[PDB]
């Protein structure tokens, strides 16, 4: 996160850190708890990943230093990538992780509500991007979970900023015109959380952008409201 500030412990209890153990253990992506065995993240995170056996999901973490060999994690039973996904820049950048065990909800870890289908026509004014990603393009994974308040940008305005790309209604953009506060390397897959009527909703999934927090280059996020039916399909399967 560029221009972010340290989060407070328990502030974003749906935020998870997805680690890989291959070749060595490190933070790979962000993610969000959406159900007791479900993590919503970005499909592009799994480019290297041939097996869910190398993945570890850590919830209730503020600092990456809390993670050692003796730290409990959730194993991943299955990786479900949207079957229309080709690349982040073309959309469908959404994946689900089915966990091997159930997340026990508490003050450190709980799910975030998905947006309501009716609420597709609501103006979100209190949106925050969180993650352990870089603070600048040439940097490193941050110890403490960072947060940044970011304004949503209309599809029309986002399309003006990305000549040569196709910004679809399945994408949602966010960022200040002058730049400065945005997602960066390592924030991918994490949430874009917006508070509406005192309830937090998972409005976006950090997906892609041209550089980090550049002037007139908003962050591009998967528009979660456009995928509620797909998420229910995969999580409510009979
Ligand atoms: O350990 C590290 O150093 C390290 C760990 C994880 C990483 N992840 C990454 O790079 C991940 C990632 C993970 C797996 C596969 C592919 C990629 C490439 C994209 N990606 C980002 O997070 C994209 C952020 C991004 C998102 C928005 Cl909304 C706006 C601007 C962004 N950026 C543009 N340029 N940088 N960020 C890096 C570095």
Minimal-distance CA residue to ligand 1 atom 13: 45
Q: What is the DSSP string of 24-36?
A: S-EEEEEEEEEET
Cα–Cα dist 170/225, whole Å: 8
Cα–Cα dist 75/24, whole Å: 16
According to the annotation, is 135 in a ligand binding site? no
Atom of ligand 1 minimally distant from the CA of 184: 36
135 backbone φψ class: left, alpha, beta (φ>0; ψ -120 to 50): alpha
Q: Ligand 1 centroid to 185 CA: how many Å?
A: 3
Which token pair is 13?
């209890």
Upstream peptide bond of 110 is cis (omega within 30 degrees of 0): no
Technique used by the depositors: X-ray
Residue appearing with tokens 């850590």: 58
Q: Ligand 1 centroid to 145 CA: how many Å?
A: 15
Alpha helices in the chain (DSSP H): 155-161, 228-235
Cα–Cα dist 7/167, whole Å: 31
The widest CA-to-CA distance across the chain, in whole angstroms, is 49
Cα–Cα dist 84/78, whole Å: 18
Residue 185, CA atoms < 13 Å, CB-side half-sphere: 9
Selected catalytic residue, list 19, 59, 93, 187: 93
Q: Ligand 1 centroid to 238 CA: how many Å?
A: 35
Specify which residues 20 forms β-bridges with: 26, 55
90 part of the active site:
no
**Distance between start and end Cα atoms, the chain:** 39
Which token pair is 193?
């959380």
Residue whose C-alpha is closest to residue 29's, from 168, 230, 194, 184: 184
Per-domain boundaries in the chain: 1-12+112-226, 13-111+227-238
Alpha helices in 129-219 (DSSP H): 155-161
Residues 6 or more apart whose Cβ sits within 8 Å of residue 11: 145, 147
- Starting from the edge strand earliest in sequence, which strands make up the sheet with 191-196, in order? 5-6, 146-149, 127-131, 191-196, 199-208, 219-223, 171-174, 152-153
Q: Ligand 1 centroid to 197 CA: how many Å?
A: 32
User: CB within 6 Å of ligand 1 — which residues?
Assistant: 26-29, 44-45, 47, 133, 140-141, 182-188, 206-209, 211-212, 219-221
CATH class of 13-111+227-238: mainly beta
Cα–Cα dist 135/205, whole Å: 18
Do 147 and 127 form a contact (C-beta atoms < 8 A)? Answer: no
107 part of the active site:
no
Q: 3-state SS of 62-124?
A: CEHHHCCCCCCCEEEEEEEECCCCCCHHHCCCCEEEEECCCCCCECCECCCECCCCHHHHCCC
């Amino acid at each position: 996160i560029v221009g972010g500030t340290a989060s407070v412990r328990g502030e974003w209890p749906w935020q998870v850190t997805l680690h890989t153990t291959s070749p060595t253990q490190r933070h790979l992506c962000g993610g969000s708890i959406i159900g007791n065995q479900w993590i919503l993240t970005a499909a592009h995170c799994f480019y290297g990943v041939e097996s869910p056996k190398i993945l570890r999901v850590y919830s209730g973490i503020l600092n990456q230093s809390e993670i050692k060999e003796d730290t409990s994690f959730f194993g991943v039973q299955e990786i479900i990538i949207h079957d229309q996904y080709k690349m982040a820049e073309s959309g469908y950048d959404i994946a689900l992780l089915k966990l091997e065990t159930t997340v026990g909800y508490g003050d450190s870890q709980r799910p975030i509500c998905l947006p309501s289908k009716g609420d597709r026509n609501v103006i979100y004014t209190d949106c925050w991007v969180t993650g352990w990603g870089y603070r600048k393009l040439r940097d490193k994974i941050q110890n403490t979970l960072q947060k940044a308040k970011i304004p949503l940008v209309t599809n029309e305005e986002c399309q003006k900023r990305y000549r040569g790309h196709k910004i679809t209604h399945k994408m949602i953009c966010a960022g200040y015109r002058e730049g400065g506060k945005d997602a960066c390397k390592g924030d991918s897959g994490g949430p874009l959380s917006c508070k509406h009527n005192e309830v937090w909703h998972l409005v976006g999934i950090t997906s892609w952008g041209e550089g980090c927090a550049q002037r007139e280059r908003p962050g591009v996020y998967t528009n979660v409201v456009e995928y509620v039916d797909w998420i229910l399909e995969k999580t409510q399967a009979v």
